[PDB]
Scaffold this active site. Sequence first.
Site, PDB file in Angstrom:
ATOM      1  N   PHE B 122       8.037  -7.827   2.942  1.00 48.23           N
ATOM      2  CA  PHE B 122       7.077  -7.751   1.835  1.00 48.23           C
ATOM      3  C   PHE B 122       7.340  -8.381   0.514  1.00 48.23           C
ATOM      4  CE2 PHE B 122       3.942  -4.978   3.303  1.00 48.23           C
ATOM      5  CZ  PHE B 122       3.300  -4.243   2.080  1.00 48.23           C
ATOM      6  N   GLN B 243      -1.803  -1.807 -11.894  1.00 49.64           N
ATOM      7  CA  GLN B 243      -1.400  -2.889 -11.172  1.00 49.64           C
ATOM      8  C   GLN B 243      -2.809  -3.158 -10.403  1.00 49.64           C
ATOM      9  OE1 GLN B 243       1.247  -2.157  -7.279  1.00 49.64           O
ATOM     10  NE2 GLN B 243       2.500  -3.575  -8.358  1.00 49.64           N
ATOM     11  N   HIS B 245      -3.952  -5.171  -7.524  1.00 47.82           N
ATOM     12  CA  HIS B 245      -3.614  -5.791  -6.251  1.00 47.82           C
ATOM     13  C   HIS B 245      -4.214  -6.964  -5.932  1.00 47.82           C
ATOM     14  CE1 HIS B 245      -2.050  -4.810  -1.729  1.00 47.82           C
ATOM     15  NE2 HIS B 245      -2.745  -5.921  -1.846  1.00 47.82           N
ATOM     16  N   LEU B 255      -9.630  -2.415   0.457  1.00 47.53           N
ATOM     17  CA  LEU B 255      -8.390  -3.256   0.452  1.00 47.53           C
ATOM     18  C   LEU B 255      -7.811  -3.978   1.710  1.00 47.53           C
ATOM     19  CD1 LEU B 255      -5.064  -3.513  -1.364  1.00 47.53           C
ATOM     20  CD2 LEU B 255      -4.897  -1.581   0.366  1.00 47.53           C
ATOM     21  N   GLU B 258      -0.995  -5.898   1.843  1.00 49.37           N
ATOM     22  CA  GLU B 258       0.193  -6.840   1.468  1.00 49.37           C
ATOM     23  C   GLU B 258       0.826  -7.402   2.633  1.00 49.37           C
ATOM     24  OE1 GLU B 258       1.815  -7.185  -2.690  1.00 49.37           O
ATOM     25  OE2 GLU B 258       3.618  -6.959  -1.648  1.00 49.37           O
ATOM     26  N   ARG B 289       3.413  -8.312  -7.303  1.00 49.62           N
ATOM     27  CA  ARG B 289       2.243  -8.178  -7.349  1.00 49.62           C
ATOM     28  C   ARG B 289       1.519  -8.687  -8.777  1.00 49.62           C
ATOM     29  NH1 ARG B 289       0.910  -4.735  -2.885  1.00 49.62           N
ATOM     30  NH2 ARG B 289       2.333  -2.778  -2.805  1.00 49.62           N
ATOM     31  N   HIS B 356      -5.287  -1.205  -8.198  1.00 48.94           N
ATOM     32  CA  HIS B 356      -4.813  -0.507  -7.086  1.00 48.94           C
ATOM     33  C   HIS B 356      -3.669   0.490  -7.445  1.00 48.94           C
ATOM     34  CE1 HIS B 356      -3.310  -1.034  -2.885  1.00 48.94           C
ATOM     35  NE2 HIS B 356      -2.034  -0.925  -3.269  1.00 48.94           N
ATOM     36  N   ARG B 400       4.862  -2.135 -10.086  1.00 44.80           N
ATOM     37  CA  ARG B 400       5.364  -1.600  -8.874  1.00 44.80           C
ATOM     38  C   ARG B 400       5.820  -2.895  -7.641  1.00 44.80           C
ATOM     39  NH1 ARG B 400       1.123  -0.500  -5.097  1.00 44.80           N
ATOM     40  NH2 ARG B 400       1.982   0.005  -2.941  1.00 44.80           N
TER      41      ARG B 400
HETATM   42  C1  LIG Z   1      -5.170   3.026  -3.069  1.00 42.68           C
HETATM   43  C2  LIG Z   1      -4.167   2.636  -1.921  1.00 42.68           C
HETATM   44  C3  LIG Z   1      -2.789   2.488  -2.378  1.00 42.68           C
HETATM   45  C4  LIG Z   1      -1.925   2.261  -1.485  1.00 42.68           C
HETATM   46  C5  LIG Z   1      -2.498   1.765  -0.163  1.00 42.68           C
HETATM   47  C6  LIG Z   1      -3.678   1.760   0.119  1.00 42.68           C
HETATM   48  C7  LIG Z   1      -4.799   1.973  -0.857  1.00 42.68           C
HETATM   49  C8  LIG Z   1      -6.043   1.861  -0.266  1.00 42.68           C
HETATM   50  N1  LIG Z   1      -1.488   1.364   0.970  1.00 42.68           N
HETATM   51  C9  LIG Z   1       0.045   1.756   0.593  1.00 42.68           C
HETATM   52  C10 LIG Z   1       0.950   1.624   1.547  1.00 42.68           C
HETATM   53  O1  LIG Z   1       0.709   1.297   2.780  1.00 42.68           O
HETATM   54  N2  LIG Z   1       2.243   1.586   1.183  1.00 42.68           N
HETATM   55  C11 LIG Z   1       2.603   2.017   0.037  1.00 42.68           C
HETATM   56  O2  LIG Z   1       3.884   2.074  -0.227  1.00 42.68           O
HETATM   57  N3  LIG Z   1       1.702   2.249  -0.990  1.00 42.68           N
HETATM   58  C12 LIG Z   1       0.244   2.029  -0.740  1.00 42.68           C
HETATM   59  N4  LIG Z   1      -0.658   2.487  -1.624  1.00 42.68           N
HETATM   60  C13 LIG Z   1      -0.405   3.730  -2.602  1.00 42.68           C
HETATM   61  C14 LIG Z   1      -0.173   4.868  -1.980  1.00 42.68           C
HETATM   62  O3  LIG Z   1      -0.553   5.020  -0.886  1.00 42.68           O
HETATM   63  C15 LIG Z   1      -0.638   5.835  -2.733  1.00 42.68           C
HETATM   64  O4  LIG Z   1      -0.268   5.796  -4.021  1.00 42.68           O
HETATM   65  C16 LIG Z   1      -0.361   7.278  -2.403  1.00 42.68           C
HETATM   66  O5  LIG Z   1      -0.947   7.703  -1.201  1.00 42.68           O
HETATM   67  C17 LIG Z   1      -0.522   8.569  -3.304  1.00 42.68           C
HETATM   68  O6  LIG Z   1      -0.012   9.787  -2.902  1.00 42.68           O
HETATM   69  P1  LIG Z   1      -0.016  11.120  -3.566  1.00 42.68           P
HETATM   70  O7  LIG Z   1       0.175  12.103  -2.681  1.00 42.68           O
HETATM   71  O8  LIG Z   1       0.565  11.190  -4.873  1.00 42.68           O
HETATM   72  O9  LIG Z   1      -1.695  11.298  -4.050  1.00 42.68           O
HETATM   73  P2  LIG Z   1      -3.023  11.218  -3.038  1.00 42.68           P
HETATM   74  O10 LIG Z   1      -2.650  10.484  -1.825  1.00 42.68           O
HETATM   75  O11 LIG Z   1      -4.054  10.610  -3.497  1.00 42.68           O
HETATM   76  O12 LIG Z   1      -3.289  12.842  -2.902  1.00 42.68           O
HETATM   77  C18 LIG Z   1      -3.622  13.676  -3.951  1.00 42.68           C
HETATM   78  C19 LIG Z   1      -4.005  15.154  -3.598  1.00 42.68           C
HETATM   79  O13 LIG Z   1      -3.949  15.890  -4.508  1.00 42.68           O
HETATM   80  C20 LIG Z   1      -5.126  17.014  -4.488  1.00 42.68           C
HETATM   81  N5  LIG Z   1      -6.057  16.624  -5.835  1.00 42.68           N
HETATM   82  C21 LIG Z   1      -6.268  15.655  -6.524  1.00 42.68           C
HETATM   83  N6  LIG Z   1      -7.005  16.207  -7.762  1.00 42.68           N
HETATM   84  C22 LIG Z   1      -7.043  17.563  -7.531  1.00 42.68           C
HETATM   85  C23 LIG Z   1      -7.638  18.500  -8.201  1.00 42.68           C
HETATM   86  N7  LIG Z   1      -8.518  18.102  -9.215  1.00 42.68           N
HETATM   87  N8  LIG Z   1      -7.456  19.799  -7.941  1.00 42.68           N
HETATM   88  C24 LIG Z   1      -6.721  20.129  -6.717  1.00 42.68           C
HETATM   89  N9  LIG Z   1      -6.321  19.102  -5.846  1.00 42.68           N
HETATM   90  C25 LIG Z   1      -6.417  17.999  -6.330  1.00 42.68           C
HETATM   91  C26 LIG Z   1      -6.152  15.902  -3.561  1.00 42.68           C
HETATM   92  O14 LIG Z   1      -6.638  16.934  -2.547  1.00 42.68           O
HETATM   93  C27 LIG Z   1      -5.416  14.903  -2.629  1.00 42.68           C
HETATM   94  O15 LIG Z   1      -4.982  15.713  -1.331  1.00 42.68           O
END
Ligand SMILES: *Cc1cc2c(cc1C)nc1c(=O)[nH]c(=O)nc-1n2C[C@H](O)[C@H](O)[C@H](O)COP(=O)(O)OP(=O)(O)OC[C@H]1O[C@@H](n2cnc3c(N)ncnc32)[C@H](O)[C@@H]1O
EC number: 1.3.5.1
Lengths: 102, 613, 239, 138
Positions: B122, B243, B245, B255, B258, B289, B356, B400
């Site tokens: 990677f 970042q 991407h 997306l 990578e 990146r 990203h 990152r």
């Molecule tokens: C954009 C992206 C990033 C990404 C990726 C693919 C994409 C399209 N693939 C990755 C990968 O293969 N390997 C890696 O190391 N990183 C990769 N990235 C980044 C990574 O996937 C993300 O940064 C990561 O998934 C973030 O996880 P996190 O748990 O911190 O955040 P989330 O997945 O978005 O979940 C957020 C949850 O919180 C709840 N939420 C949000 N706002 C509220 C409010 N308003 N009130 C109550 N709940 C809330 C949501 O329900 C959600 O479930």
Amino acid sequence: SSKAASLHWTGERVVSVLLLGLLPAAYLNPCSAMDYSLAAALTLHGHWGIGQVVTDYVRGDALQKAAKAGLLALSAFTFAGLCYFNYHDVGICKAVAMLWKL
Amino acid sequence: STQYPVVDHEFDAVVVGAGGAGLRAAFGLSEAGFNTACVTKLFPTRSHTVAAQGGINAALGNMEEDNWRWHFYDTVKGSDWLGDQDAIHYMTEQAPASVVELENYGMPFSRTEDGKIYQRAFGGQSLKFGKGGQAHRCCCVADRTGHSLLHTLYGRSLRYDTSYFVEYFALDLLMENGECRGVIALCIEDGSIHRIRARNTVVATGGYGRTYFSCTSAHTSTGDGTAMVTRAGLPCQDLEFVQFHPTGIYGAGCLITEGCRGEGGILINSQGERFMERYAPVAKDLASRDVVSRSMTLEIREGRGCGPEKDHVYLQLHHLPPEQLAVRLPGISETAMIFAGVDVTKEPIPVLPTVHYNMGGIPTNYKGQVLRHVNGQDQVVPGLYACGEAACASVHGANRLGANSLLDLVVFGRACALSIAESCRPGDKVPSIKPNAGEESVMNLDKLRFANGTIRTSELRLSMQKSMQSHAAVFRVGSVLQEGCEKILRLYGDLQHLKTFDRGMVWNTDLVETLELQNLMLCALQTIYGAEARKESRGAHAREDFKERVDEYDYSKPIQGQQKKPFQEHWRKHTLSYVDVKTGKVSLEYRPVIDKTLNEADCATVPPAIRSY
Amino acid sequence: PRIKKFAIYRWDPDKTGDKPHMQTYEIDLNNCGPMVLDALIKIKNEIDSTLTFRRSCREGICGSCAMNINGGNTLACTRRIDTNLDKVSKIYPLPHMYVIKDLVPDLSNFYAQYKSIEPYLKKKDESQEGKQQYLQSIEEREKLDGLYECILCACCSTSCPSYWWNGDKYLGPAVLMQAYRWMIDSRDDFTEERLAKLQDPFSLYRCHTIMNCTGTCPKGLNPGKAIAEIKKMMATYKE
Amino acid sequence: TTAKEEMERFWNKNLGSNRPLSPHITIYRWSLPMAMSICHRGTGIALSAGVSLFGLSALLLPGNFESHLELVKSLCLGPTLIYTAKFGIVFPLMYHTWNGIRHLIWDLGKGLTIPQLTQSGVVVLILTVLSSVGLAAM
Ligand SMILES: *Cc1cc2c(cc1C)nc1c(=O)[nH]c(=O)nc-1n2C[C@H](O)[C@H](O)[C@H](O)COP(=O)(O)OP(=O)(O)OC[C@H]1O[C@@H](n2cnc3c(N)ncnc32)[C@H](O)[C@@H]1O
Ligand code: HEM
Ligand SMILES: CN(C)Cc1cccc(NC(=O)c2ccccc2C(F)(F)F)c1
Ligand code: SF4
Ligand code: F3S
Ligand code: FES
């Protein structure tokens, strides 16, 4: 630690292949012995058949109690009706044969 | 306010978020014995983390023999020495332990000849502290690694008695005299309002990618927890560091991984030459990146276009084996066919550098504790934690490293659970909140519910997104950043003139997206102002006028006959951003990066050096 | 300029005595995306900001925008709009589901069923977990292909006629395939009792291989095949 | 909360509310696989009704089988008119027999792809018309 639902499903597929085997067997070897086994497989498969239709559409505790009883009464009368026909009348095999060249 | 029924809930701990970090923190507390509630606006599976494709980094040493200290070096080198090394230490050491943990939970990782977890190369990863060449430590579930991570983390969380508040939009933090008391949330189903109070609060709400017009992130990536922190007057860290991407489909903004480059993907310009060897000789197209996207974005400015109107570049999979693109990367095989209309085995993928990752977020300990800044010194906010993308322990720092976020999730999600398990016990005194507390969030909700201005929510969102896209791109000058700042500030005043059509209690998607808009704006202001103030080219934040990387020393020449620059004269420091909610004024403070590790004898501090591959 | 017509199911719970009805929106396809969700958000942003629907990834890898478009349960972000202008696209919520508002179904029962099968790795001795990585041969990993990819969009289950009539007691396509997903997993020790949990006439045996599940799956998966494979395990497994 | 409690609270919430059931039979698009399952039910029920009527009449209606044949002979035994009755009996029976084999092939685990389904569906549909004309000619 019983598995009654799995055995019932298995039983259904066994009588299905039995009924599939009996149809050409009746055409090839038409007799009284083939009449009763055809009367047995024909009523059984059908009784379990409608049994599925009942469990699918009929919703309720009081209704399914009555439907499964009424189906059993019908299936019992159907098997008795065929057995009487096999014993006192020409039998299933001969009846179809007579009806066909008509 | 006599319109809204308030139903108060009493728990030991509240985790706001159902992503990777959100989930791991949630059930980890329940497993520890805590009465835990989990507040999420989406269903846990719909959380972005599902969209993750690349992989999860661990020095398990399944391809070659690996050391986690080599992974430590790669992360800090990638962080452009803005990364806090106490946090990077903790994560890289926990890397193998946390992955093994997931595989044992039931995560269906791709397998090897031996039968162990399949790792692969990677961007920006190297053996023997950068000397030993290419490194293979990215653990992946084919191309759907984030999907499988989220599903097995969710699956495992059913084994515990965690109270899931599914589809509950968290509005604001319940705060009283510095100490955090929980969260006030809107129930989307019946429109009711719930004051969920606890001893400790874990914010894991992911990034704020929707601040820009073109992002790889989901529509629900609106930095909601970030806003809740700044509405409490607490600082946000390194928000200007966004970042880009290098490889994301030009069309809808989706997306491709990578991992395309990790297996053997090549980047093609106008002539057809491998243009990434022209920029970075050693790491080539598998570089960091900030370096790869820097090349691609500048290539268009040369006139070297590739599209119909000459705007996007290329990632080519014309030469890659057909059977390799079925077991290694089958997820991108389908997604490129849908939006771009491209067969991956014969036709190249059209890509453009797009938003990203937000390495910035809520300032955090290596223990997961939220930090306020008082008298130039650090200070823990009592009963407030943050983990994941929404947080900023600055493991990623200025840039990152590839496939580190999914690690950052599992590790710091776990860390938040452990820090609570040690500081207090389940069934301890849950502090009481004022009868009239959180009322301003309810009143805010009511104001937007019956909003009737001149500018619609969607039109103002578009005006924010396009403003950030042209003013805060990959490259940015002080001149264009200044115009972007006053342009965004103008749109914050435009929030008074908001128009709302849906006036219902049940499922008001018009209202929640307007709530999201408030959050998005508050993230945008801190991003753009922090960017204009920072006068250097560090990590992802690159300035054409200030092309130099400004540290406390000039680390190009030997460290001896050099007078150390004062703290308020260099730029090797964290950007702390505050914003006055009523006027939209952005005020900035700065706190130093952590260089010391958790153990010098076990993992030595890596001092600043030249940033090139 | 190309004008496409959209007929969408509309219901408001906050409006007194509002009965379910269809509402038509017209859209210019030049300044709009190729997919149905791209169109749905376009009317949401401009024409009517009351159209309440579920969206997230717009990538076809989350399962929020699952709905019945033109008599088929698929993801709106994956389904591209029919460029035929004379035809009017009819957009409905998932079939035989309680409507919360507009195209938003109550999936609470659906998720609950997924909780009842226990979709998590079960070892008979879990004292050694968290330190050793479990070994799984490359061939045993091939077994999970076509099964783990499930996004839980509920498209397949909500297309099943048997899941319409018996949604309460029959688990359905999506949930059953996941039960199978944890059955053939070489790391799972509870393969036997996972089958015994289906020993009533409703949980599994309400399927009659109508095949609407595999036919409508937006991800191309084959739940029905797996369901038939479960039935085979049920007749063969001993003790 | 548990899985059984979530299901129990699901129905209590929805039935005690004015939420509408989303259309299903009215809206869903038809296909050959779909339609062919309706017929297998229909034929199964019709055949069971036929067998039952044949059995039940034996116990209830007086006379032997030959007496009932001469009763049918009262009307004109039209060469193509009696063919209608002869075809109308076998047609559902043979469809159900052929489609029944297809069901048995499925339960065995084979032929469960969308192409194979529509392929074998036609085979069953064709075998029916051939065997039904072929048996009526006997
Ligand atoms: C954009 C992206 C990033 C990404 C990726 C693919 C994409 C399209 N693939 C990755 C990968 O293969 N390997 C890696 O190391 N990183 C990769 N990235 C980044 C990574 O996937 C993300 O940064 C990561 O998934 C973030 O996880 P996190 O748990 O911190 O955040 P989330 O997945 O978005 O979940 C957020 C949850 O919180 C709840 N939420 C949000 N706002 C509220 C409010 N308003 N009130 C109550 N709940 C809330 C949501 O329900 C959600 O479930
Ligand atoms: C020898 C030819 C036949 C074969 C191969 C056969 C096979 C089958 C099978 C395997 C099923 C179960 C389908 C399922 O639910 O998975 C079925 C359904 C059924 N069959 Fe038959 N059968 C035959 C003849 C008959 C006859 C003569 C009758 C009349 C008594 C009959 C009555 C029924 C009924 C009532 C059903 C249930 C309807 C449904 O749930 O779809 N079958 N058939
Ligand atoms: C799919 N459309 C719209 C047609 C339609 C409408 C209503 C019922 C059905 N089909 C069944 O009722 C059915 C048929 C064969 C076996 C089992 C069943 C069922 F399980 F009971 F559901 C089909
Ligand atoms: S099996 Fe297919 S249709 Fe069913 S929930 Fe999964 S992706 Fe959706
Ligand atoms: S759509 Fe339902 S019928 Fe059984 S195979 Fe089918 S799950
Ligand atoms: S929104 Fe993610 S699948 Fe349609």
